Symmetry: D2
Amino acid sequence: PDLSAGTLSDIFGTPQMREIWSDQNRVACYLEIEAALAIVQADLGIIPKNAAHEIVEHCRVQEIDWALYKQKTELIGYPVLGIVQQLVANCKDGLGEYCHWGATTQDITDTATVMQIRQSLTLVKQRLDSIVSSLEHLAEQHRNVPMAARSNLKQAVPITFGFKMARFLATFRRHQQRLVELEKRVYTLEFGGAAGNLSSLGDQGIATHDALAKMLDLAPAEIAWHTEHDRFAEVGTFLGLLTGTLAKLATDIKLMSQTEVGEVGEPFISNRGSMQKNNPISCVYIHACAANVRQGAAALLDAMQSDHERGTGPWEIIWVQLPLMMNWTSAALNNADFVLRGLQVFPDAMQHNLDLSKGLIVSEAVMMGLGNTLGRQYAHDAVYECCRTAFVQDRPLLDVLLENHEIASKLDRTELEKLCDPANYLGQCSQWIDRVLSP
Amino acid sequence: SAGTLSDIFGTPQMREIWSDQNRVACYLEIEAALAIVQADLGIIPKNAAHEIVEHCRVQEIDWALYKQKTELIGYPVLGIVQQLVANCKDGLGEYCHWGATTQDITDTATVMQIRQSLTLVKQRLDSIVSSLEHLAEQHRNVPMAARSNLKQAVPITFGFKMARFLATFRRHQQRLVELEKRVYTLEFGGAAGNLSSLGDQGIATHDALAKMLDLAPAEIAWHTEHDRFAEVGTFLGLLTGTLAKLATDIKLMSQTEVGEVGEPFISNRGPKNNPISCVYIHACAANVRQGAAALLDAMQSDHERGTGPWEIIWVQLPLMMNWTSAALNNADFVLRGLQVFPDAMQHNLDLSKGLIVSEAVMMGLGNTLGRQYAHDAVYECCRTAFVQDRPLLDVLLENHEIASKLDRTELEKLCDPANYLGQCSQWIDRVLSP
Amino acid sequence: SAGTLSDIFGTPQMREIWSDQNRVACYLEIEAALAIVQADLGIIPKNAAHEIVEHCRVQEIDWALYKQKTELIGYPVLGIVQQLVANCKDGLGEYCHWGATTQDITDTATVMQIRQSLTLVKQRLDSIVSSLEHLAEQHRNVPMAARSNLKQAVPITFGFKMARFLATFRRHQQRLVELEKRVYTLEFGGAAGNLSSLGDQGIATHDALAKMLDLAPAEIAWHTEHDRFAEVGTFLGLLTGTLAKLATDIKLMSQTEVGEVGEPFISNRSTMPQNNPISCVYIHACAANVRQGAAALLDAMQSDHERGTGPWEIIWVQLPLMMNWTSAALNNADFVLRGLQVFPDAMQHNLDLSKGLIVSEAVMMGLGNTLGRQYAHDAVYECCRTAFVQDRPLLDVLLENHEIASKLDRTELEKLCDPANYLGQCSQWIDRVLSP
Amino acid sequence: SAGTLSDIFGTPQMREIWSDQNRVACYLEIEAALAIVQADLGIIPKNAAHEIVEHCRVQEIDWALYKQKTELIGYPVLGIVQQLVANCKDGLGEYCHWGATTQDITDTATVMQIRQSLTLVKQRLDSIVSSLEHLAEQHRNVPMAARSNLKQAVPITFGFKMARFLATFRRHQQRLVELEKRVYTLEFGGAAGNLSSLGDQGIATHDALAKMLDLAPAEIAWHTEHDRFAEVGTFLGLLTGTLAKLATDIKLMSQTEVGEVGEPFISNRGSSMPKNNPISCVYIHACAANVRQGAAALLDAMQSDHERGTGPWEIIWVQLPLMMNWTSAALNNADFVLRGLQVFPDAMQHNLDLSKGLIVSEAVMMGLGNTLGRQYAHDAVYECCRTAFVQDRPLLDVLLENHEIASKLDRTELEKLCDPANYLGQCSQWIDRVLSP
């Protein structure tokens, strides 16, 4: 088990995920399943015990002739019996004729794919843990930094940057719970034979299935699921849900990185953004990866139409989309991880953007305050008419408020500036942040 | 309702849940509950709460004016708020929609609509599971040919095939209850999610509003965090994918040349028997899987209100609920009255004249000759049986060692497809045991 | 219709084309043409063709009865056929539908509906094109900052940016004309495509029916060959793709911090002092639904044998939605482009954000002769990076290099640092799209 | 370099067009053509052009360093440009990439790659079309049961069925020819489309470079205007849809219970049980499904913002090579199957006779229409079909027991009306209509 990369293979993928879904790890998973099967069937008394040992001793990927395997896969049409043929030829005294006993190739591919998935989700759980940790730090560190919230790409009312990070944090917490829920279904053995009923094992296939299952630390199956692809498809839809949030994160960050906005920046790495333009390339890659995974999810839903006891086409969609969606997702997870660990935050630009409306962004605040001293009704009417006068003449809301003599007589400039200061109107952002950090 | 296909690719129950009238009805329950909460906590006068709840009535809406207002405003709530304020007397409606924003209403109405919609789905699923529970038992020992790559494989039972659908639909039930924790959640955060205008009362209004509607309180605002809605969509995709397989298998078994099952007999629904339910299931599943991709796409809502992605949900979630209901409805109907033809399954088992159970002949003959040597020898007789279109039994008897070790009475039984059923019944037991 | 959002994610003209009523109107138009065609050829009695045509009128259909019958029969034609026979006198009912199968009518109806729909699309495209031709010429010399990866790149003009949309919509117009001559095609082949019940009159009927309906005669039956319908789907995907970009760029220029364009001013079009880009919002959501719709229609192409068992029916649902969603997007884009507010002052303000850094490239070339092309590069590069860290004009830092200050005077220098002086051949490129 | 499935869901020829090496080779041909154009226009010195063209060779690329620079820079051109400058002598490499931005190179190379890919696709289509012309003629008179909703309908001929594919593939050929004139277009516009750095020589450079590369000059820059690439994607979706139908039909006709066709015989190509397996059909199906979702991602990619997209443009980097490779494998399999398709007329005949004459009840109604009434014969034959099907008896036998039927038509005449081989309509005329251009 040792170590193939093109120009972009580590841009839209990761080295780790590529290895999990490599031909070598796949065939290794195959050989692990075959070895465990032999051992299981030996204890049960189905196959000789000396044969099991010899099989296990040749269940090693390093002994695989790859060019021969490729050719035999293309001729046979499926990717297992080529490995079986070599396993049989590698065993001495014909003891290889006891491997693959009662198994069909989709038993090996489905169970391999579950093993590869479990390895894959270990990396995703790690990426998620780190992303969550960064968001926890970011929510606290930036708990009290004011900025303009945006609705339909227009300024709404002030919030804090840590508030925005708390909302991402709550989402990734949900994704984590979704992940652990699907694991109990997905981490399941597939061993049913040609038709799912293990006809060639007699009264023994279900003892074999139950023993093979926890030999490989997998849940026993209720019943065969060769054309019941809901375990594989829900992994795909989870990847779609997770990358969706990654894509929102990328959208918000690249939007806050605009020359005209300048409120955040990806972590500085010398000459990475390609004067000094630092393009949000991590956001760029996340976006493209999310787009490809969401369509790959639709392909895996499509794949669930596998007919009868082996799909004539739909099953084979999983061979292609699953590795790709894993690799794309890991690239997006890697990039968001990197961005959130060293994210630059520019409070002075957030402050400058808050001051663009010259107090109109806190029109409500002024109203609320002036209410007790002027009257709910006059407060509404006066602020609304003052806010609209400031809009047409490009003036501070304060300056127009001060031309209302009843307002000027009731409040001194100093009180009115605190009402006209966007930084004084954050509602309960910090208490909301606290509610997310609390668990 | 009146459209020709409105009940073919939809259903009346689901269509009314997502109708303009039930949506505005959900809006009005929310605004009334909000006024009750804010009166009890002292934010608005209690005479306004009473006046507002009594005018939170869908019957009072001028729909033509509402529509014209929504097309002007751009979003679907403040048109209802405008009618609620004008309907109140001396100006007590000025205290409705107090500190809320339109998406608080649309999001939370959609949760309520989703909960109504999932009650129907849960209800259809229950019916489908028991139909499969009885079918698995009823046809437990009905032999038939399993098929791989649309070629005959080895014999199974029709109940075994039904137990596999049964296990699958149960997992979908588990996924339904699982997402319900996340989805049944209040959305109340205001313009930017922090309830700025409610001051130190914003969180209290949210929390007490939540239990007013029997909804979980949200960790934090989720106006552009659409993973609850998108997750429902991908569940409908997963569900309609299994319905699509069922429709695929039934319509394949409904072929003139196969004739092993048939959709329930109705009148002149097809001398015919067209699998039109399978047809509708298929078209529904295809549209749902694509809509699910649209819902993932919609998760990219920017900042605190999406500039486009959010609106994708306004269109896709009703369609996908309606499409799924139509597909669940048809699968419920077909499974409840499914016709099963054991004589056709038997005729198809005999097509190969024994080759479909060459594996059984190998096993039985392995005891006296050896697993490896019997495998090769029987495979060599399968050479002669197929090329000369003979029964395998006849060719097996022309081999010396096989005839010398096994007699004709015993070869006819290894060559009977009805005897090579494996442990099918134990597998239906394992699925029917829980 | 009358739904709150039915004219927001759709339009009246498109809803009508795909309405049950216009669909059935198409059905009866086809059945009347068929009876007449078969009277001329002698297949049916001329008294039958006359009586049938007199009753091919959408006003006479029992809509509730047609609905229940379609739900029982399973397909949407024989319910209308049954009422046509009951409405004719002296049993003249079916000499109609003579040798036709239901999908002959649906397919041919859908083709007439697509032609009506594409009549709308070609009109909106013509208006969009004219607005863009006007905007490209109007704002031919309006400088603004181009943007790459959402960061400013080098100056362009706003009319140059509109010319690039214009060139795109012209390509979409060509695509539309190209597919029309494939799509406007008759479907008349009967149950299995060979019109076996018409004997030696099948091709004769088909070719006469095609001329009657102003459609091309089919090479052969295409009941399970959905490429004509699917390529309409993919064209709606392509076209809405461009509309979606237009929506993305306009809403991006509408941000509070950018403010370079705005949707046409209308009333309270959502209250807080102010106007959200809802046209952009609707275009985006319609594009998203159309592009997935085109994938379902590619999926539909897998209709088995001589009538698909599911794939065909996907078209019943997807095609009308995609036509309606697209018309909603085209209406909004038409509206936005006809009265688009453009703010050259905000464009100039954003050009001046970097205080000359945006045209550092021009400073290098301009300083090349007096310094040396490579000292110019190295010196402007380092002066630019000092100018950013201190938030000062590039000019001022350039004048703090004594070698530079000795070679050129300040007049020459904030001509080269003036972003408006570095616009390239934007105007000549605009011309190429207008075609002078 | 090839993995286990690299030639199963892909092809060597297409994998090679989209490889790193062919892509970088296109980059270098464009850089060479650029220096040659600008040397003639006097924009760069001719000695530099000669030195730049001499080093525009893929063989001189350090691939590991190119990877490292691309991961750092973010985009895949300037790593090749860096090596081209350094490989040139006397600092003459500073005149390459003159006025270009990376997307000019990636877009134009992608165009060159697409043209090479459509050369393969056109060769596959010609072969598929030729195979179908032969099959439509050879099986012009082979009768079989047509199928609607997977139920037998009325009789047709297998050559009629193949003529229907043939007409479809000719329409795809027309679509390909139509998009090529739009797609085969130069991209050369600089950072923002206006070639600001080239001044009054930008348009002059663009048009000379275009004809140097045998590409149409562009109306205007199209860096974020991806309709040419998305159009290629949707065409692949249309084409693989037809291939997917062909695969669905052939695999349905390959069922154990149907047995009407079979994929070409290759010793042990079907995993086996003495058994075959429609593996070619299996692969076409999965390829069409992946191509069709990619078409959606290419449409999604059209939302590139302003003058260089922040994300959407990069979708094309991944989707286009994959969709092309997937399509090439579907075309490879479809070409192979159609060249050696096995047709079993005896099975088609056996399946026709299953209904015992019901499949041609329509023909009996017409025949008996003349002497009894077109409407009356229909209802009368239709009532007879109930007894034949409820009793599992031949339609002929029940017809001979209907008294006015037997009075008006003899056995010998009802033989012919009940023979499914006599109700084929104008299948041969329709085949002729397709084969005739």
